[PDB]
Amino acid sequence: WXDTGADXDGXEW
């Protein structure tokens, strides 16, 4: 869990 969103570059998935 974490895989689907570090706080900035991308978003969810």
Ligand SMILES: *C(=O)CCCCCCCCC
């Ligand atoms: C949450 O997304 C944790 C990531 C799961 C790690 C599973 C190991 C993968 C390499 C064997």
